[PDB]
Design a protein around this ligand. Structure first.
Ligand SMILES: NC(=O)c1ccc[n+]([C@@H]2O[C@H](COP(=O)([O-])OP(=O)(O)OC[C@H]3O[C@@H](n4cnc5c(N)ncnc54)[C@H](O)[C@@H]3O)[C@@H](O)[C@H]2O)c1
Ligand SMILES: NC(=O)c1ccc[n+]([C@@H]2O[C@H](COP(=O)([O-])OP(=O)(O)OC[C@H]3O[C@@H](n4cnc5c(N)ncnc54)[C@H](O)[C@@H]3O)[C@@H](O)[C@H]2O)c1
Lengths: 390, 5, 384, 9
């Protein structure tokens, strides 16, 4: 019937992730989403934001307490630094018992700075009985879904093997004197493994509809000191410490078919995912949330066939969050009208419809932990039970 | 860029 | 001393085999420097047949290993037989060879033996015999391997930030030629994805980068236990055969020099090879369609790609040719012998080089079994 | 050549 009332923690018109992605989506989908509540530590900014965006329905709350309690909210969105997720969401969840209308809790990836915090958060979310949503928007990319479709329909045949090559961000030999210090210190929830590799390995499991059984990882900090740089792209003859990793080696096996997976992630061509099937090979590529290109190959007298799938002018960064929101709306308003559906689901798993949940994020955090665990202990781990309960 | 977070 | 190296062959056969396609054509070209004086087969009729088909005007067909290995008409023995028979033939041969004061070189094909144990015994015995040894790791003589090795060593690409390797190898995929030896598909017979395709490749890698590994981790697969037989047309004969050798190898590790990350994937199928070396100043890529064909250099408001490709270079016979060349040069112009080539440009790979490689290959299997990352930084100094 | 060449040893 009526639009979904959205309360935002982390929406800021001046800066941040939510203004570039979440807002533009909620803007397009005004018929279905409405922002009714903002919370910042500084109330002046919440208010400033409401005026710059002319949020004719937004109320700027002064406290987490007040915000989380308000019954003018159907969905809360958390879009703040990962290091503050746990400290803000655990309280918020307690307070939120004073809102009978709360239905959805939407949290950005990563969920927390550690598997422990992530478990606590998931536990608490369940106790609260709301539907949850994590921001693994890769699951909504047009490329990922076509690939998944092709694969699940037998178009490449059985998966023989997979290779992944990846590039990570500012974890090369250089750092913008701009970018913060919290990005480059371990345990703050943002890094090569948790982020770049997290998003990628997830879409891999999702496209192939399989989890891992065994994995082995080596994690590197071969670049402990980074070279600062300006906006011109020139070095400022200044060095800064970096405790987060600059390289990740990862190999493992998928449960379904015991498929070999070789992966390399570097800190500095953004992304290549090579899936070799018995009938066709499938390749996904990137440059500069993309993923921007999908390619399929087939093999006196032989024929070769190349299928390219490319959306000419597509903005993945806003594109994927959009489709995530759209997918939440289609679930709420039941656009494909299936009267026979309950109001809530634990996880998406490998289903096409719906969206990733905190349970999906938890499983991922479990896989991330196991990676680090593998590296330190220097051993190959059996991870095939991760993804059992909660 | 804001995407590096 | 102005005299040609007199060569005794075990495994030279004019009808079939590796040595006829590679070793012989080389020895043919280099007649001024190499001469075949002795053949041994289990069947003397074939040794003789070979001598006549090739008009080996100086060849004597010996009836027994004993007689062959003892003959003093031989300066270099070459072993080019199935890997599973190396140990059983070389250990005796080495004993007998004490009756030849002229023996100077022992040349053995890769792989050395079916196991690290056999390989150790063989190396031990080779040392006790005091001859110069040579293993057939001929990639160490590829023009491409050498160019890449130079560029790298002259700092032309900067520091190595990381390495990726992708290989396809042999008939270890879904299909297998109907006329094809059963033994090369049963594990422990010295021929397989790891020992062979990966052996040769990882070796040239260590050689190009002048570094051994410190830590490694491997997963080895047999996801294809039954293979589909095929004819010469390339069509399936609706028949299946067991295969206990691997169809996939995952390998990751670190090089000692610089602690460089190395990601490797090897598949059983049938783009042969890509070796991607990422340096601080440039990228270097080696490709093939498992004998390297092509070397690419990438550097940098403008981008540059440079391709080094020799034309009419046959790598199969050419790299083996070049190995005999360096053995010839050695016997004639130039320590009297060495332990190993290590990362040197000049000289040739020896049994010690092969041993170190067998040690790494053993570790690969050990890592897969133990299920843990291993420290291999000592295998270039002493036992595993 | 879809046969077992001598190089496959
Ligand atoms: N690919 C992706 O899905 C993607 C990309 C980038 C960032 N992210 C994630 O989105 C989240 C937000 O990133 P960001 O750079 O916008 O973070 P941010 O902390 O800078 O933005 C949150 C905003 O909320 C306010 N705020 C800050 N700390 C707060 C606190 N503890 N309590 C209440 N309000 C607070 C501030 O005004 C800030 O502008 C992070 O978890 C990040 O990992 C995801
Ligand atoms: N370096 C490379 O890239 C490369 C490539 C292919 C093969 N090889 C190696 O070359 C060697 C020879 O391979 P091959 O397939 O030609 O061997 P092969 O056994 O099939 O042929 C060698 C010949 O030696 C004779 N012979 C066989 N068994 C013998 C024994 N027990 N005692 C004495 N003589 C015997 C036979 O006449 C046979 O024709 C093997 O070690 C193989 O691994 C190396």
């Amino acid at each position: 019937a009526a639009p979904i009332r959205v309360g935002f923690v982390g929406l800021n018109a001046a800066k941040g992730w939510a203004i570039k992605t979440h807002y533009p989506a909620i803007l397009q989908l005004s018929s279905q989403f409405q922002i009714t509540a903002l919370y910042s530590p500084k109330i002046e900014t919440s208010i400033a934001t409401i005026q710059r965006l002319k949020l004719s329905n937004a109320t700027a709350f002064p406290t987490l307490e007040s915000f989380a309690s308000s019954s003018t909210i159907d969905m809360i969105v958390i879009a703040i630094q990962v290091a503050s997720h746990y400290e803000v969401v655990m309280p918020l969840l307690e307070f939120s018992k004073n809102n009978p209308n709360l239905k959805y809790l939407f949290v950005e990836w990563a969920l927390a700075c550690s598997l422990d915090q992530a478990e606590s958060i998931y536990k608490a979310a369940a106790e609260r009985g709301v539907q949850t949503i994590i921001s693994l928007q890769g699951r909504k990319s047009p490329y990922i879904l076509r690939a998944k479709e092709l694969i699940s329909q037998g178009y490449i045949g059985d998966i023989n093997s997979i290779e992944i090559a990846g590039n990570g961000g500012w974890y090369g030999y250089e750092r913008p004197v701009k970018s913060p210090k919290y990005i480059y210190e371990i345990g703050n929830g943002v890094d090569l493994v948790t982020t770049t590799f997290g998003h990628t390995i997830d879409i891999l499991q999702y496209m192939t509809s399989s989890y891992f059984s065994r994995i082995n990882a080596m994690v590197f900090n071969n670049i402990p000191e980074q070279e600062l740089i300006d906006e011109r792209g020139n070095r400022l003859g200044q060095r800064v410490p970096k405790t987060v990793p600059d390289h990740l080696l990862f190999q493992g096996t998928l449960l379904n078919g015991n498929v070999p997976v070789s992966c390399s992630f570097k800190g500095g061509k953004n992304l290549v995912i090579d899936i070799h099937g018995t009938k066709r090979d499938l390749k996904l590529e990137g440059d500069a949330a993309e993923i921007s290109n999908l390619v399929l190959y087939y093999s006196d007298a032989g024929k070769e066939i190349m299928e390219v799938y490319h959306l000419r002018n597509y903005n993945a960064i806003v594109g994927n969050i959009h489709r995530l929101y759209q997918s939440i709306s289609d679930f709420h308003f039941n656009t494909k009208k299936i009267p026979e559906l309950p109001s809530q689901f634990v996880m998406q798993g490998f289903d096409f419809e719906g969206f990733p949940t905190l349970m999906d994020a938890l499983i991922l955090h479990r896989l991330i932990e196991s990676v680090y665990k593998s590296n330190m202990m220097g051993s190959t781990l059996n991870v095939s039970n991760i993804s059992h309960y909660s | 860029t804001t995407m590096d977070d």
